[PDB]
Every structure is written in C-alpha cells, then in structure tokens.
Design a protein around this ligand. Structure first.
Ligand SMILES: O=C(O)C(=O)C[C@@H](O)[C@H](O)COP(=O)(O)O
Ligand SMILES: O=C(O)C(=O)C[C@@H](O)[C@H](O)COP(=O)(O)O
Ligand SMILES: O=C(O)C(=O)C[C@@H](O)[C@H](O)COP(=O)(O)O
Ligand SMILES: O=C(O)C(=O)C[C@@H](O)[C@H](O)COP(=O)(O)O
Lengths: 280, 280, 280, 280
C-alpha cells in the first residue's frame, strides 16, 4: 500500500488515457501533490474525468485521496526496495516490514516449489564433475555465495559474473557437467549467450529464474522461482534471498547423494579453519 | 531431532564420562550401530551404566533407542547443514525442512532485533562518505552482496575478503566513515585485526555478528544477530540469510535518510541496464 | 618464425586462391604434413601452382620446405601464446623466448608512448574524486590489479568486470571523475556500452587500448597502446603486461601530483600490514 | 639515486650512531633540509661528526650535499614506488624510468632463472587435475590473472585471496594436485598457514617468491624469483610483473605438454567470444 508502488504495478490494468496519468504521477509525484485537478489534467493532456477515473482505478476515493496518499508515499526507501514503506515510517516500522515481506516471499516460493524439478537438478549436479554458477549484479553475488557452499561437495565449483569468462568456461564443459544460470528477470542478454553455449556444449543447464522468461525457455531444468519483485524498478533484495535458499536446497540434496564418505571430508574442511578462528 | 546434531549440541550439558561417549559416537556413529553395549563401553573406556546414562541424557529411552535413532541420523546432508534431516528424507522432506528452518531463524532474529542499534547504525552510515564491508568465507559473500546494494546510495561502498586489502583500506578511513565487519562466529582472527584498525582510525565499527563475541566487544555499534548456527561444525547457511536481511534493513534506512533526490539517482541507475536486459 | 603463427598473421597479404590454402593449413596442419601436392590441391580446391605460390608467399622455398616447417611448427604452446615456439623447444628455449618477447614488446610500447596523452590522463585522475577501472577477461584482472595500486592515492578506486555493475557505476560518476576502460582488442561490446555511459555522464574516459579501435574512438584521452598481440587467436599475455606497466606510470604520475602529505598516508597504509606479515 | 630511497636501502650497512641519523632523516626529510648541522645533531641526539660520517657513508660529499640531494629527493612518487624519481621529474622522465626499471628487473629475473625448477613446476602442473593460486594484495591479483590464463589448459584452475577459502580449498587437494603460493615478501602469515595445509594434504607446493624466505622453505618446488623490490616500504609493482611473466612460462610449459588436442580446445575457447566482441 505504498501508492506509488501500487501505481507502477497496476499500469497494465489501466485504460490508455489513465496510463498517461499514471506515468506523469510516477515521474513527479510532488508536483501532483500541489496541483489542482485542472492543472494536472492540462499537464498530462487528458480530461479531468480521466483524472478521477485513474484515482478510482488505483483504489483511491477521488482526487483528494490521491494527493493525500501520494504525500504518504514519498519515502525515498520505497523507490529503493519493493516494500510498502511510508513517508512517516521509523526503523521499528520498516525493519518489521522488510522481514515480513521477505518471510512472505519465502513462504510463497516454498508453496510453489516444483519438487520434481528440484530432484532433477539435484541429480544432475550429483553426477557432475563441474558445477558452475553464472549471474550478474545481485545474481553474481548469489553465484559466488553458491560456489562457497558447493566447493566442499566433492566436485569442482566455480562462479563468474564476467560474461567473457562465462562464455569461455561454458564451452569447456562436458555433457555430464552442470551450469546454473541465476536471474531474477530471466532477461539478461549476456546470460542468454552463456546459456546457449552451455546447451551447445551438451551440458545440463539449470535456470534459477521465473518461468516463461527467455532464460527459462533454454533450460534443461527450469526451477521456476516466481518471486514477484520488479527489478526493472527496484533493487533486487527479496528475489536474491529466495535464490539463495533454493541454492541451499540443491546443496543439501547433493550432500545427501554423497556417501558417508562426505562426513570426514567436511570434518577436514572445518578443521582447516582452526588456525584462522579463535576457539569457542 | 537428528540425533547426531542433537548430541553435538548438548555436549556441554553432559557429565564428564558421558561426554567421552558423545565424542566417540560423533566420531564413528556407524561402528556404534553394530556394537554391543559391552563393546562400546570398552572402546570408549567407560562403564556400561555410563552408556545408558548418556542415552537417557540425550533423550533416548535406552541403548536400543540410541542405535535406532543413530541409524535414522546417518544422512550426509545433516553434517553439511544444521537442518534436522533424516536418512530416509526425500527432496519433498528436506526442501520444506530447509525453508521452515530458515523462516524460523528469520522470525527469531526479527523478534530479537535491537531496534535502537539499527537506528544508530543507519545514522552513522547515512553521514558517511565511505562504507566498507569486511568478512571472510560466507561473510565475504555477504560483504560483496551488500556492496552491490549500497553503491547506489550516494556514498562510496567497497567490500573486501582479502585481509591485507581490509587492513590497508581500514587505516585510510576517516572518523566519519563506517566499516561493517560481518561474522557468524565473531571469532575470525584477521577480522579482529581489521576491526581494531577501524577503531584506531576513529571510524565507526558496526559488527554484524552475535553478542558477547570477541568481535562484538570491539564494536561501536553491535547489531547483536544471535542466529543459532554452529559454524564450527556446519556450513554457514541460515546465518548468512539473516545477515543479508539485516543488511537490507540498513540499506533501506540509509535510503530513507536521503532526499527526494535519491529517486532520480535510482532511475538513472536502473536506466543504465536497458541495453543489457531484454525489455519486458 | 613459427610457421603457423606466420601464416595466420599474413593472411591479409595473400592472393584469394592462396588464402584458401592458408586457412586449410591453419585448420589441420598435420594432414598437410602427410599430403602430396596433388592431394592438398584437391582437398583445398585450388591448382597445384597456387600451392607453390602460397609457399613462396609465406617465405618458404617450396612445398617440401612448407611441410618441414609445419612439422617444426606443431608445438601446442604456439597456439596458446604469441611466441615463436617450436615443436622441439625445451624450457630453456621457451622461457627465454617468452621473456625476450615481453621485453621487446615493452620496449616497443616505451618507444611509441604518447607522452602528452599520459600527462592528460594523469591530470584528469589527479583531480578526480573517483577513478574506476573497467575490463573483461585479462583486462578485468588488469582492472583489479590497478585498483589495488590506486586505492592508496587519496581517492576512491574501484574495478568491475561485471558489465551490469560497470553500467550502474558509470552513470553515477560526476563530470570530474574518471573511468579507465582497458581492452587489448578495443572491440568488447559491453565495454563500448560502458564507455558510452561514461561519456553521457560527462566524466573523463581514458582508454587503455590500441588506436583506431571502436573503444579508442570514444575516448576523452586515448592512451594508444599498440601492442601487437592477436587476441582473437592467442591468449592475452604480452598485452596485459604492457597495460599494467602503463597503469604504473599513471599511478606514479598521480602520486607525484599529491602533496608531501602522501608520504605519511603511505606510511600508514604500509604500517597496517605489520600484523599480517612476518618481520624481516 | 633518489637519496631517500638510497638511505632506506643502506640502513643495514650503517654504524649504530649513523642509523639514528638515517631513521630521523627518513622520518622528516623536510625539517633536515632547513636545519643546521648543530640542530640536526641535537634533534637526533648524536655528535656533529656522526652527521658528516653518515653523509659520506651514503655517498654524499658532506652536509650541504645531503641537504641538496634531499631537496632533489622530495618527489611523492618516490615513496609510492621503487623508482629513482626526482622532485623535478616530468612525465617524460618518470615514464621512461618506470619502463627502464621494469625492463632491468625482468632482465635480471631472466638471467637468474632456475630452469630446472621451472621444468619441475611445469611437470607437476601438467599431471594435476587441479591447480590453485593463492596470494594476497598484489599477489592476489596475480593469482586471479593466472587463473584466467590456466583455466583453458584442460585442468580445473582456481584463485583465492580469502585466507579462509584458501585453507578450506587446500585441504581438499589430492597429492597429484598443485598449489602455487605467490608472495613477494615470502612472509605473509596466512599464506604460510595455507602452504602448510597444502603440504599436509600431500599436494605439490610451488612457491613463486624469493629464496631464503619462510614461504620458500616450505616449497616442494621453489621458483626463487629474487626481484629486489622492498614492499615493506614501496607499492609492489615491478615484483608482480616478474611474477606474471613467470606465470606465463609455466602456462606455456603446460600447454606444450598437452597433445595436439589442445589446439581445437583453444579454438573453441576463442570461438566462444565471437558474440561478445566486434569482428576485426
Ligand atoms: O542492481 C540492480 O538494480 C539490478 O537490477 C542489477 C541487475 O542486472 C541484476 O542484479 C542482474 O539481472 P538479473 O538477475 O539477470 O535479472
Ligand atoms: O565455509 C565454512 O564452512 C566456514 O565456516 C567459513 C568461515 O570462516 C566463515 O564463513 C568465515 O567465518 P565467520 O563468518 O567470521 O564466523
Ligand atoms: O582469455 C582470452 O582468450 C580472451 O581473449 C578474453 C578476452 O575477452 C579479453 O581478455 C577481454 O577482451 P579485450 O581486452 O576487451 O580485448
Ligand atoms: O599493497 C601493498 O602495499 C602490499 O604490500 C600488500 C602486500 O600484503 C602484498 O601485496 C601481499 O604480500 P606478499 O606478496 O605476500 O609479500
């Protein structure tokens, strides 16, 4: 219920004249707040009724309600991240909102899991000699986070957010190897180049992205993580938490597939840190 | 209720003779499963009653229950991550367990937040020219994830998991600048060196770690994130999710502190990706 | 005088029929070595005289000389790097060849330096608050190497080989800031996107690449580093050494521009390493 | 012949009283330049003859020559890097000095190569499934540069400047695997921990560092790269160029060891970049 977020999100459901209003509001909400209905209509180039229909369309009671809720909407934080933050919010408010939104998104992802696709992804990785993680920006951090979990699972794990390294590494994969392309939009152009090179190498392509995206269409195994975070507009935040939890399921699954031999391997890995960390 | 996890966790609550049993069990649970009570007692060097007291101490009904629950405990995944996974679990089981455990930990962190410490951390960062994120391993990935969120907030943001880069960068900080040291154990030795250099520079040290740890003792602002994940034994997983959500609260708080000027800055940042990402 | 390298390099100077021969030879030199002149001509689809003209064109005395020098050419190393390595070479041979080639290239770069362009690059960086280094692959390593030299020079220094991070960071630059795009080909597509964003931000674009390339055409200051290494074919090696030495000149120049204040700043930086390094 | 560099370098050859003078001069050369002989002697707490003996010891003709050459010495660049830069130098001067110094150091390294140690290092890497590169700071950039050269040579290549990642990765190495620890000082404490873990894993430890250092003492194969750059005082510059050229020799050697199969592998790697780079 940040009204500016709500407007951006319902642009598609709007009549053509009303969308003109929506985009003008999104562009300079503070000028609207001090505008008359006639000024706004003239600035946007629509009729005054179109203004009021827009207001009712986005769930306001009329013009004054729009201006009131716009004023309550002007929290710089609400343009940083897709959380319903209001102008007056204190840390007590937005810290809980952020946690609650993240908890809700994770609960939704959990509810919509394609368990079969997880099984298939786990099995492909468990038979691979190499697993590679590819992504950019936020998804590049997820890639590196994943490599840190997976390197200990008795295979060779690597992560790259450099598209040239991705392409060159992808063509060296064997058909039994696995690449995981990570993308909240499924639309990063360099990543589609990389994904095609993985396919042409014969290797298994796991896509950690929403369904029906260009990236998902290339997948050997599509994990179909449909987190609703509009990262054409907001900083990716909730989306990369969901990705990391899915990564943890894949790692756990691969660990399950290893023998009892894994335990002593992991003891060795943990023992190597003794010199670097103070004892408890 | 993975019995091997439960044993490792309750070592401290045990009588001295019983702890001998605990450590022998943790070291080779499969030999115990095919041992008689007399064999085990002889192998550990304790009395047979000490065996049965150990069993009752960790909540088993007796010796046979121990062996039964040990057999149910031998899931290689349960030594990879601190999730109550059993030998027989399928993806349907451990995927939900992993999500549920993560949701629970986040709910606990949310419940225990020191809101005042958040306000103080947000305020220090909001007045800084530089914010730097320091950590190793899993906390190094969190550091880089954070730098990707913060670079857009009208300050200079950097992350380092190289301790030499950390030390050299820390001494160049001004008193108004901020460093965030990230650590699930609070005991990484190089990070304590870095934290001391931040203090000696006069800058604000924010520690994203549990309370009562060596790192927390150095903090200007201790965030006191007491996620219960034993990373001397298990892969850090749930702990780094909590850290990232706390990072998101700090970023949101800093964004709130910026003017309405931030919105157009973030529009520019998002607009720069248009050439790199397919349109929706 | 690796004949296969020599052939690839003189493709442009060749008659049309002869180029057919060149490309067939480059593709499978071992089959040529056991071919008759008539077999080769038939396989390539040219006349036998075209074979012999090709041989004389690339400086062989005739067909037998071609086959002899092809056999001497089959050193897997000579396809890895642009060094005149022969099939029979030992470490004593190719270690000196590699050093000598690198020394020669550096001497050539030194001889062709545009000293004025260096002065202008140094001056722009010396007045910047931020300097950023952008490149991919080998040039991404150069970028990170540079950031490690420059962070101590009383400005904010960053390096990115992720094109999404590059674009988002570039649009946040001020007109007084500086970006250095590093490229041996001057033709990396994502880097041209980044370079255009730097220009549109008003900032100074320094290009560390050959003259007359697409990247150089965008430059505010083109450093015109015309190292002759064909990185469409060979691993970049000599090119990135030259780039790093040029980077060192720029850093030295910026250091010269700082006050006597810099000395105590650098003492602090070096002092921060005392805990991390054993005393001498 | 930067006098301050010369003084720092000849501290060891000095009489005890004279060293007091040396360290006072190094600490505040500008106060010395405006001091009388009596003032300086009093400030340092030595006799006036000790002043003049110090001057003659470092090759000055007397007190006035010291002050003259100190004034010529105050180039902030000369404390940044170990190049004989003077206060009056222009880009034309220090660009050539930097190239010439680098060329000289490379020529010295070339002259002192232990060719046998190179052969042994090449052979160990050529039989490895994994090669890992470990270093910090400047040597961490060298490590990542190396991984970019080596990943294409039909083995698994990784680089780490995070000491925790180094330790955990090192203990997972097999005896046939190889780690290369890179260090200009040979004294980085975390790197000695990593090197010991490599030895205890049974793997081959190649040290790319000077002889007679703590790191070199651990080596399976010591490459003995005795570049004279004092990185307790100066930015590492010339040292990391030498390391990278040695890395190139090792890569070339490993490429030589691969079949003729490597050529088509490298064609594939280079072909993967076609979509990412504009055609020539
Ligand atoms: O930092 C931001 O605002 C971004 O959206 C970066 C963006 O390119 C992302 O993080 C990379 O994109 P995808 O995950 O491929 O959709
Ligand atoms: O990967 C693992 O198993 C670790 O525990 C690495 C470990 O050093 C950690 O990720 C760095 O430690 P802290 O967060 O400082 O407690
Ligand atoms: O590793 C190789 O074989 C490359 O050529 C990678 C390549 O894209 C380069 O390193 C990045 O290209 P530029 O420096 O932009 O010409
Ligand atoms: O950047 C500098 O001034 C340094 O000396 C960093 C320093 O720790 C070095 O780069 C890491 O050390 P070594 O190569 O191990 O001797």
């Amino acid at each position: 219920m940040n009204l500016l977020q709500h407007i951006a999100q319902s642009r598609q459901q709007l009549r053509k004249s009303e969308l003109k209003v929506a985009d003008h509001v999104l562009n300079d909400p503070a000028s609207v707040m001090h505008s008359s209905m006639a000024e706004l209509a003239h600035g946007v180039g629509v009729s005054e009724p179109t203004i009021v229909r827009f207001c009712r369309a986005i769930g306001c009671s009329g013009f004054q309600d729009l201006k009131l809720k716009l004023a309550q909407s002007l929290a710089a934080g609400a343009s940083f991240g897709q959380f319903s933050i209001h102008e007056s919010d204190s840390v007590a408010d937005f810290s809980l909102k952020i946690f609650d939104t993240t908890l809700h998104s994770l609960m939704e992802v959990r509810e919509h899991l394609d368990t079969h696709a997880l099984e298939r992804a786990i099995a492909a990785i468990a038979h691979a000699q190499r697993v590679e993680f590819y992504g950019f920006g936020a998804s590049g951090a997820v890639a590196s986070d994943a490599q840190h979990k997976f390197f200990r699972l008795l295979l060779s794990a690597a992560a790259y957010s450099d598209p040239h390294m991705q392409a060159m590494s992808a063509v060296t994969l064997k058909p039994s190897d696995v690449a995981i392309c990570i993308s909240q939009s499924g639309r990063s152009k360099d990543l589609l180049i990389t994904a095609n090179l993985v396919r042409e190498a014969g290797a298994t392509l796991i896509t950690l992205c929403p369904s029906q995206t260009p990236l998902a269409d290339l997948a050997t195994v599509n994990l179909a993580i449909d987190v609703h975070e509009d990262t054409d507009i907001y900083t990716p935040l909730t989306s990369r938490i969901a990705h990391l939890v899915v990564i943890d399921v894949l790692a756990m699954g691969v660990a399950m597939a290893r023998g009892p031999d894994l335990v002593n391997h992991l003891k060795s890995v943990k023992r190597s840190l003794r010199s670097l960390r103070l004892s408890p």
